[PDB]
Each structure stands twice: as C-alpha cells, then as structure tokens.
Amino acid sequence: SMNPPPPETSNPNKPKRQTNQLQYLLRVVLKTLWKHQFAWPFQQPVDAVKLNLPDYYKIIKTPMDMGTIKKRLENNYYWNAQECIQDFNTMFTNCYIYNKPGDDIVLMAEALEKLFLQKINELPTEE
Ligand SMILES: CCn1c(CSc2nc(N)n[nH]2)nc2c1c(=O)[nH]c(=O)n2Cc1ccc(Cl)cc1
C-alpha cells in the first residue's frame, strides 16, 4: 500500500489571516511539541511504506501531522486558531484510533497532548 498525497499546505484560493492566536499556536504550541523527545513520529506525514503499516490509510481518512501543521502555520494557511487546534486534535485522534492502548506511540501522543492542552488553556485573547 502506497502513501496518499499529503494534506495540503498551500492553496491560493483559501483566504488567510496572520493573527495573534495563530502566532501563539506557532511560537508556543507547535514549538513546544516539536522540540519534545517524543515528537519524531509526529513530525511528518505517516509513511506507511517505510513503517510497514499497510492498513494505516484504510483506517485513517483524515491524516494529520506536525510537519503539515508547521508548514500551515509558517505559510499562513489558516484563517483562524480553531482550524489549527482541530489539526492537532485530528493528529492525536488518529494515533488513538489506529493504535492499541498502552502502545508506546499512544504514550508519546498522550505526553504531547498534555502539553498541547496546557498551552491552549492560555490561548490569548484575540487582538
Ligand atoms: C504517529 C504515526 N506513526 C508513526 C510515524 S509514521 C512516520 N512517517 C515517517 N516518515 N516517519 N515516521 N509510526 C507509527 C505510527 C502510528 O500511528 N502507529 C505505529 O504503530 N507506528 C509505528 C511506531 C513508531 C514509533 C514508535 Cl515509538 C512506536 C511505533
């Protein structure tokens, strides 16, 4: 089983904004998770070929990863913070749905999700 095309990170049709909540999502939320020891499985689209996960994209129909998120943030793909928060939550959900409780990768996602929640609890006020 081949990999699918990755999620888009560029779309000139899509209206864009650069905003203080999006800026926080990049410089605080993404940066915190990206630097973590457990980030590496989440820093790029799942390569089902290299990882020998031939059923991954049969089960996961909304792939998402931090490499995509980082590019969406840096390339101002989003209109609002909720879009980006949803991408992180999609990524965590994918991991929990595909894998088994207690698997290493689920523990890794949990650790990142804890930090995500701690940072989005203090999402700033819109300017
Ligand atoms: C979170 C996505 N993911 C990736 C990362 S897919 C990847 N793509 C590329 N290019 N590098 N890593 N491995 C995964 C998964 C996933 O959901 N489920 C899995 O069982 N694996 C195998 C695995 C990898 C690392 C650890 Cl520590 C434990 C298990």
Q: Characteristics of this structure?
A:
127 residues; mainly alpha; Histone Acetyltransferase, Chain A; 5 helices; binds ligand 5NV
How would you sum up this structure in a few lines?
The protein is mainly α and 127 residues long. It has helices at residues 20-34, 56-59, 66-74, 81-98, 104-120.
Task: Write up this protein.
The chain is mostly helical and about 130 residues long. It has helices spanning about 20-35, 55-60, 65-75, 80-100, 105-120. It starts with 19 loop residues before the first helix and ends in a 7-residue tail after the last helix. The chain is globular. It has a single domain (about 20-125), classed as Bromodomain-like (Histone Acetyltransferase, Chain A, Up-down Bundle), CATH 1.20.920.10. It contains five helices and no strands. The site of the ligand CCn1c(CSc2nc(N)n[nH]2)nc2c1c(=O)[nH]c(=O)n2Cc1ccc(Cl)cc1 has 12 residues, from helix 4 and helix 5.
CATH architecture group name = Up-down Bundle
Structural class label: mainly alpha
Helix percent reads 40-55%
User: What's the Cα radius of gyration?
Assistant: 15 Å
How would you spell out the order of helices and strands? HHHHH
> Roughly what fraction of the amino acids lie in strands?
under 5%
- CATH topology category name: Histone Acetyltransferase, Chain A
User: What is the overall number of helices?
Assistant: 5
Report the biggest beta sheet as strand number plus sense, adding barrel if it closes.
none
Distance between the termini: 46 Å
Shape verdict: globular
Q: Give every kind of bound small molecule, once each.
A: the ligand CCn1c(CSc2nc(N)n[nH]2)nc2c1c(=O)[nH]c(=O)n2Cc1ccc(Cl)cc1
State the CATH class.
Mainly Alpha
Name of the CATH superfamily: Bromodomain-like
Overall strand count: 0
Number of domains as seen in the coordinates? 1
Subcellular location: Nucleus; Chromosome
Family: Belongs to the BET family.
Protein name: Bromodomain-containing protein 4
Domain Bromo: 17-123
